[PDB]
Design a protein around this ligand. Structure first.
Ligand SMILES: O=C(O)C(=O)Cc1ccccc1
Ligand SMILES: O=C(O)C(=O)Cc1ccccc1
Ligand SMILES: O=C(O)C(=O)Cc1ccccc1
Ligand SMILES: O=C(O)C(=O)Cc1ccccc1
Lengths: 180, 187
């Protein structure tokens, strides 16, 4: 069971299997620096009920596993009738952060098994299935050559699951300012 | 007289429409602009995009070099597929695309060269902002809202909001140096 790359950043595409009528397809960008033990994710939050809250949330989250504190910048997009979107930002938020969203050693700590191989985003990929504890199964697809992440499946794709795709992973230097 | 845009700026963006019509999408992504390099990068689900006419929803990363007059697009198609499970999304990378690129999506001097007037101040994204209104000759009006203290972009309005406009918001603009690799134009 392999590690993830020491640092990576990618656009991401986030969706569901199956796609139910109120499921959203979204995008953003994310950064994971495992040396600093820190990540950042910018995008429209998925899932988020506009039905129950009255709005769609855009979020930028900086999760610092070294200090155990996350920081969130938030904007709300509400629907009004005059039919328009009403932008309002919410308070910044902090709270506990036990580990990164994908810990570098996740496949070793949760005892992943190799389920086989799948073409994902036009690349050949290793499927690594592992059980989140008291939460359910997950599959992480790693590029079967470079070892960088292609797709993150949270749940069982055969019944119900979140999917996050990473189409342009860069393993390059991340400037300090990104995690300011 | 209107200001120049910041020499370099990058931000998450949220992209939408006024008014929101049935097929209109709210999307998000990230964008980088370097005016000394005469280059820009935008990553996101393309908005607007006709899934009805094409068969899919497009995610794209585009690098547009106004200096070399060339663009590079990385493309991934998300298609709907009927399945035993109801239906599911199928990702399909398309070929990378290259081609001509005339000018940056938001040129630094755009307010100056297109003769923008100061129409007032407004709070945009919780910040006091200056509104600059101008005409894109042969196309329609625009308003660009700039942070009134820092001069950075906050909201780009393409069209007239009270009838039909696209809105792009920039909630976390950074004036930090942009590493060269961001504009590498390889997946
Ligand atoms: O799974 C997703 O698509 C998300 O919503 C992740 C996320 C986390 C923090 C800020 C924005 C998006
Ligand atoms: O574990 C989560 O809750 C996540 O949001 C994971 C994730 C990772 C990368 C981009 C978006 C979401
Ligand atoms: O206005 C938008 O929301 C866009 O779609 C801009 C864009 C340009 C190039 C790649 C991705 C998104
Ligand atoms: O004018 C356009 O066509 C654009 O795409 C402008 C833009 C600027 C910043 C982020 C996304 C799109």
């Amino acid at each position: 069971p392999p590690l993830l790359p020491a640092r990576w950043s990618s656009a991401y595409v986030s969706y569901w299997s199956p796609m139910l009528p109120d499921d959203q397809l979204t995008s953003g960008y994310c950064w994971f620096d495992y040396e600093r033990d820190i990540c950042r994710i910018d995008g429209l939050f998925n899932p988020w009920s506009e039905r129950d809250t009255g709005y769609r949330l855009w979020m930028s989250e900086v999760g610092n596993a070294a200090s155990g504190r996350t920081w969130k910048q938030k904007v709300a997009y509400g629907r009004e009738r005059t039919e328009q979107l009403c932008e309002r930002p919410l308070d910044d938020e902090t709270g506990p952060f036990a580990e990164l969203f994908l810990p570098r050693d996740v496949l070793r700590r949760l005892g992943a098994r190799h389920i086989g191989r799948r073409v994902v985003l036009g690349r050949e990929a290793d499927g690594w299935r592992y059980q989140r504890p008291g939460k359910g199964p997950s599959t992480l697809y790693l590029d079967a050559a470079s070892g960088t992440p292609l797709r993150m499946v949270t749940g069982d794709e055969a019944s119900r699951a979140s999917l996050r795709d990473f189409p342009n992973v860069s393993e390059a230097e991340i400037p300090d300012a990104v995690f300011a």
